[PDB]
Each structure stands twice: as structure tokens, then as C-alpha cells.
């Protein structure tokens, strides 16, 4: 229940494949629910493709909460997780 503060963070600084897939799914679901996007569609209508473009421009407004087995967690913004 106690958040590990941003200054120290034990878990990997890289986005995992599962984190990428879940972020894309969540953002695509939000877009499919008419959420505003922060990228240039250039004619794109697919929420998944728009979410992929957002992830490419590193503009998805979500943060990954990685719970440790000991019950704690640390937050990693999508932008600060590197691919």
C-alpha cells in the first residue's frame, strides 16, 4: 500500500511487452470511447492504430503501477518507460 517514491525505483526502467500491449489496449479502448487524442491522425480512424501512433510520439497519458510481491508498488509514466 506504500508507494516507493520516484527517486528510487528497483524495477526495470524498460517497458515490458505485456506493459506495451496493455497500454495500447487501454488507450485504444479510451479512444474508442471518444477520448481526445494528442497526435495527428492523418486520416486514421482505428483506435488501436491511433494508440500506436500516440505510443510512437510518446504521448499516451497513462502511468504503469508495478506492484511488488511485498504489496508495495512504484509508478512509471509511459513517457519515462523506454522501449
Amino acid at each position: 500500500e506504500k508507494a516507493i517514491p520516484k527517486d528510487q525505483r528497483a524495477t526495470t526502467p524498460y517497458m515490458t511487452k505485456y506493459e506495451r500491449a496493455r497500454i495500447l489496449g487501454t488507450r485504444a479502448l479510451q479512444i474508442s470511447m471518444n477520448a481526445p487524442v494528442f497526435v495527428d491522425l492523418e486520416g486514421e480512424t482505428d483506435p488501436l492504430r491511433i494508440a500506436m501512433k500516440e505510443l510512437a510520439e510518446k504521448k499516451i497519458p497513462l502511468v504503469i503501477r508495478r506492484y511488488l510481491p511485498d504489496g508495495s508498488f512504484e509508478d512509471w509514466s509511459v513517457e519515462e518507460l523506454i522501449v
Partner: protein, 49 residues
């Protein structure tokens, strides 16, 4: 015989190993949060990579 035995060892080992996943502290644990490997393979390396 192989067709008849397909899906038996995989199913049994699956029932055994379904819930073992890598944790964010690099430990392999059961779904009861009990440690099976403090590090995967004693190396932490994915065989796929």
C-alpha cells in the same frame, strides 16, 4: 499412438506450472506469492532472447 497421447504431458505440466510467473523483483513465484526461484534459471535470462 502419438495422436492419442498428444495433449497429455502438456496438460499435466500445465496444471503443475500454470501460475508460475516472473515477478517485478526478478523472482519466480506461485500465485500464493511463495518463492520457487529467487532468480529464473539462476540467471534471470529469457531463453527466447
Amino acid at each position: 499412438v502419438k495422436t492419442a497421447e498428444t495433449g497429455y504431458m502438456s496438460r499435466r505440466l500445465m496444471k503443475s506450472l500454470e501460475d508460475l510467473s516472473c515477478q517485478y523483483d526478478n523472482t519466480v513465484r506461485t500465485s500464493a506469492n511463495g518463492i520457487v526461484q529467487f532468480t529464473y534459471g539462476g540467471d534471470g535470462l529469457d531463453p527466447l532472447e
